Amino acid sequence: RLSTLIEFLLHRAYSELMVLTDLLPRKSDVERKIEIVQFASRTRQLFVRLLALVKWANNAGKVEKCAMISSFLDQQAILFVDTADRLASLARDALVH
Amino acid sequence: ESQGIERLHPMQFDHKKELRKLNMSILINFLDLLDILIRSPGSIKREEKLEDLKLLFV
Amino acid sequence: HLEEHLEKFVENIRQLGIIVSDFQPSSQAGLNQKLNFIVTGLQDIDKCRQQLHDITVPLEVFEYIDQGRNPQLYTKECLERALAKNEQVKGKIDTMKKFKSLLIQELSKVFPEDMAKYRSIR
């Protein structure tokens, strides 16, 4: 990751703000209102990101438990697949003799 | 079967006795394979038993 | 779980500040710089928390976030995987039990030597 995307969005917003303030000496009241609306939209996006982070942290321990269970299940499935491959090789691949 | 490797069957070489021994070996191999599949795949004796059974059949 | 409460409080405070300063600010518009600094501080705090906790950040959450869908699909997939794993474990246990029972029955009906072998040596 979240830090990567957070820093990328922050750098993009900073570059946009710098490019918009470079020509600040020619901004009117309508331009100020448009900038305020853009800042409000950015704040709404940040609030939505914070709400998403909160919803993800509210189910983070369960997510970690499910990931550990999935890893254990993948290990068990790999062991079962190896056993099945050995049985198949012993029963239908080495019966030439 | 009595020369080259360990000789377990006696000089009788009875058809019924050999068939019962082969059936017991196959049952033991299947039981070991099932136990390995159920508990843990850390047992590789199943493939060795299957190769031994194939050599005995040959 | 204080990061979520802190983020919610920061968002509420930013919304209140925007609603209060929605008027005509004659001074320099420092609101954008203040929001950028607050976002940078929040990102740094979240990184510090994730490094102190050292949680296993998976790629599936990031993929589902970049895709633009809900985590309900991932939850259903994990539930189906857990159900399939439980069913496979139950099937393996039942197959092992049936194999043991059939071997014991065949030994008792044919040769007790194999039964004694499977019961003591195995």
Neighbouring subunits of B (3+ Cβ pairs under 8 A): A, C
Which DSSP symbol is given to B7?
A: -
Closest-CA distance, B5 to chain C, in angstroms, reads: 22
Distance, in angstroms, between B3 CA and closest chain C CA?
25
Chain C residues whose C-beta is within 8 A of a chain B C-beta are 92-93, 95-96, 99-100, 103, 106-107, 110-111, 113-114, 117-118, 122
How many DSSP H helices and E strands does chain B contain?
A: 2, 0
Q: Judge: B34–C99 Cβ closer than 8 Å, yes or no.
A: yes
Determine if residue C80 is left, alpha or beta; phi over 0 gives left, psi from -120 to 50 gives alpha, anything else beta: alpha
Within 8 A of B38 by CB-CB distance, chain C residues are 92-93, 95-96
CA dist., res. B35 & res. A56, Å (int):
41
Residue type, B38: I
Q: CA C43 to CA C38: how far, in whole Å?
A: 9
Task: List Cβ<8 Å contacts ≥24 apart for A87-90.
Answer: A87/B33, A87/B46, A87/B50, A89/B47, A90/B46, A90/B47, A90/B50, A90/B51, A90/B54
What CA–CA distance (Å, rounded) separates A82 from C101?
Answer: 25
Shortest CA distance to C93 belongs to which of A83, B39, A81, A77?
B39
Q: What separation, in Å, do the N-terminal and C-terminal C-alpha atoms of chain A show?
A: 55
> CA A72, CA A68: separation in Å to the nearest integer?
6
Interface contact flag, C110 B35, Cβ < 8 Å: no
| Numbered residues of chain A with Cβ closer than 8 Å to any chain C Cβ | 2-3, 6-7, 10, 13-14, 17, 29, 32, 35-36, 39-40, 42-43, 46-47, 50-54, 56-60, 63-64, 66-67, 69-70, 73, 76-77, 80
Provide the 8-state DSSP code for C113: H
Cβ atoms within 10 Å of A84's Cβ, excluding its own: 12
C-alpha angle C75-C79-C81 in degrees, rounded to nearest 5: 115
**CA pair distance A45, A57, nearest whole angstrom:** 18
In chain B, after which residues does the backbone break, taking C–N over 2.5 angstroms as a break? Answer: none
Q: List the determination method.
A: cryo-EM
Q: CA of B4 to nearest chain A CA: how many angstroms apart?
A: 17
* CB-nearest partner of A82 from B41, B51, B58: B41
Say if residues B29 and B50 touch (Cβ distance below 8 Å).
Answer: yes
Token pair recorded at residue C83: 């159900």
User: How many residues are recorded in chain A?
Assistant: 97
Residue in chain C lying closest to A69 (CA): C82
Sequence length of chain B is: 58
As separate numbers, helices (DSSP H) first and strands (DSSP E) second, chain C gives: 5, 0
CB atoms within 10 A of CB A67: 17
State whether C110 and B23 contact (CB < 8 Å). yes
Give the 3-state secondary structure percentages of chain B, helix then strand then coil, rounded to 5.
Answer: 65, 0, 35
CB B39 within 8 Å of CB A83: no
- Distance separating alpha carbons of residues C5 and A14, to the nearest angstrom: 27
Residue B10 φ then ψ, to 5°? -75, -175
Q: How many helices (H) and strands (E) does chain A have?
A: 3, 0
Structure tokens at C17: 């500040």
* CA-wise closest residue to B24 among A13, C103, A37: C103
Token representation of residue C97: 């039990």
Tell me phi and psi for residue C58, to 5 degrees.
-85, 165
The stretches of C54-71 forming alpha helices (DSSP H) are 59-67
Which tokens is A71 given? Answer: 């890893």
Helix, strand or coil, per DSSP, at residue B39: coil
> Taking chain B, what is the end-to-end CA distance rounded to the nearest angstrom?
9
Q: Cα–Cα–Cα angle for A36, A40, A44, nearest 5°? A: 170
Contact C113, B24 (CB under 8 A): yes
